[PDB]
A paper describes a structure:
However, in YP_001813558.1, an unexpected intertwined swapping of two of the helices that compose the conserved helix bundle results in a ‘linked dimer’ that has not previously been observed for this family. Size-exclusion chromatography combined with static light scattering confirmed that the dimer is the major oligomeric state in solution. Interestingly, although the YP_001813558.1 active site assembles quite differently from those of the other NTPases, the putative metal-binding sites in all three proteins are absolutely conserved, except for a one-residue offset of Asp95 in YP_001813558.1. Furthermore, the active-site residues that are involved in sugar binding of the NTPs are also conserved when compared with other α-helical NTPases, but those that recognize the nucleotide bases are not conserved, suggesting a different substrate specificity.
Here, we report the crystal structure of NTPase YP_001813558.1 from the extremophile Exiguobacterium sibiricum 255-15 (PF09934, DUF2166), which was originally isolated from the Siberian permafrost.
Residue numbers in the entry:
A (entry chain A), B (entry chain A): 2 to 170
């Protein structure tokens, strides 16, 4: 039933040449900034836009978010910084686990089971291999590109939501 | 081996009287803002602070994050808003699934298996029941309070990181 989330993303990383550590290793700060940004693009911006009915709502929600973000930074500025690489790894792991917990709570509040949705995203991601079985990388920024004939996940994700609505009716 | 993440948080929500939907239901915007904020407090602020060695690093990372956040909002402002409740649910589910995927990728980049860490957080959360088997709620803000004798997760989470480092050595 439940997907092996970590092994599935680990697999995506190997297949498409994203970073992966075989031994626990603190994530370098410049790389962490990227990951934090990508995560929030989805968990904050897309989530809030898709929760909004107009520009006025959406902007008020973003500003409220920004104020909470700023309060959290101000609180963190008063806390001492890690002094070893192990300390940085431990604090990252702690933060990533709570973040995972909150994401999961948002699924609970939405009444959506995440496993089948994650499975759709995983399969579509893996289907980005070209017809030679190799990833397609664009010369600008090495972005992984979609091959000709690739079926996008969005409509299936939507059909999965409707399926769950029907199951729980 | 792998925890049932969704069922474990669903359980935490029932036990401690947080919201939960039995049928798939779009999350109201004011509630989504809260969840987005809590998620980013961990995935962005705590994660970046624990990735930093000093105030100068940390502030540069936060500003870089904010610039990416602002670019994403500007892009989203040009996209049409959902016009039904089902549309809002579908877009939230989509966003929450990608966010989950990125969190998982951060575990991959750190080389940390999330399951055992999540298990420690889950168990500590569940152990917040008082000695009558009931949650303790503070009159200010109904915050769930820790009972006398509660063992905090942080040191165990750290010991778990060291255990994984040892296993992968």
């Amino acid at each position: 039933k439940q997907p092996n989330y970590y092994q599935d993303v680990k697999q995506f990383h190997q297949t498409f040449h994203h970073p992966g550590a075989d031994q626990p290793t603190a994530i370098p700060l410049d790389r962490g900034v990227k990951r934090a940004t990508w995560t929030a693009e989805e968990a904050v911006v897309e989530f809030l836009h898709q929760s909004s009915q107009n520009e006025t709502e959406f902007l008020a929600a973003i500003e409220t978010f920004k104020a909470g973000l700023d309060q959290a930074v101000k609180k963190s500025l008063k806390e001492t910084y890690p002094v070893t690489e192990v300390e940085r790894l431990v604090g990252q792991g702690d933060a990533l686990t709570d973040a995972l917990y909150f994401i999961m709570g948002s699924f609970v509040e939405a009444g959506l089971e995440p496993g089948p949705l994650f499975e759709i995203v995983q399969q579509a991601n893996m289907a980005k291999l070209g017809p030679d079985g190799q990833p397609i990388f664009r010369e600008s920024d090495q972005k992984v590109m979609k091959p000709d004939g690739w079926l996008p996940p969005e409509p299936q994700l939507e059909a999965e939501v409707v399926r769950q609505m029907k199951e729980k009716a």
